[PDB]
Design a protein around this ligand. Sequence first.
Ligand SMILES: O=C1c2ccccc2-c2n[nH]c3cccc1c23
Lengths: 328, 10
Amino acid sequence: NFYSVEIGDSTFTVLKRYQNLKPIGSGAQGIVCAAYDAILERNVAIKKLSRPFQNQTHAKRAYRELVLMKCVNHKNIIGLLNVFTPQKSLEEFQDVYIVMELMDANLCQVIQMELDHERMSYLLYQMLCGIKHLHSAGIIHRDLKPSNIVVKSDCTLKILDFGLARTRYYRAPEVILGMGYKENVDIWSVGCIMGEMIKGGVLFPGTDHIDQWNKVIEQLGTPCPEFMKKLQPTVRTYVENRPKYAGYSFEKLFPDVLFPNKLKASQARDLLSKMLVIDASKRISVDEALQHPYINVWYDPSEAEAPPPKIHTIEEWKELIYKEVMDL
Amino acid sequence: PKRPTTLNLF
Ligand SMILES: O=C1c2ccccc2-c2n[nH]c3cccc1c23
């Protein structure tokens, strides 16, 4: 019924209905290949979790994903196609495979290239759609980097994981300094990408999380003292020991040169000037963003405002996970 | 405003 393809240093024993498996997934949460679903005649993505269970951690990180994928559903989020196991029983049960849609590639490069507001503002619009949905599902990503935001030739955008759940330049100050983070936390990440999409290069580089915070203040602008206090004891010092960096304006930061129908480019700046706000408490919100005149264009209630998704010993997991791969 | 049905990854 199943067949085994040896991919790299691990045998991938999937359903015969999947051919041409090719590894593209060199991620840590699992190995993901690109197969072909002969029973739909379409490109899918198969990810194998080798013995998800083996330690309280993994079994949970895995149990998380499984669950999420089953109830999370949006056109801008990596949709599930099929979870199965070759193991015949809970006994021998010890390997989980998830099939889900196959996208053409993440934003890692497309961003460099030059895209019109139409394609840009849009791709963005789509991200707020998944993110928002994700959010409306007690889920906040945190780890939003173009490295995990896949796109398709038809200009379709989707999200790969749920990242953290409860390459570093795309995280927000609340995580950098380590502090309270709200839902609008993932707005910082988007902000960067958009900029890093216009700038044509990482908005905030930095060799370390320190040199990271430094280049962000420098560039953006020193946290008005009120916020400074919200900082932990040692990190507050640091900032307070640094020169006066009133940053720059969004006009000089993102010059008109980087842009290409004439106001749109400054209309898009107004958004950045509300997405790139270090003080988390003054940073724009997904809702507000979708309403922004730069994104609103593409708005659509069916998409934007979607209906919310849904709601232990080692052995207990194996049983759980299995029970999960078995509900099909 | 017809949504872009093309994206150049290459
Ligand atoms: O890492 C990728 C990935 C990387 C580049 C392009 C497409 C994908 C992709 N398409 N579907 C899935 C499911 C899980 C992981 C990944 C995918």
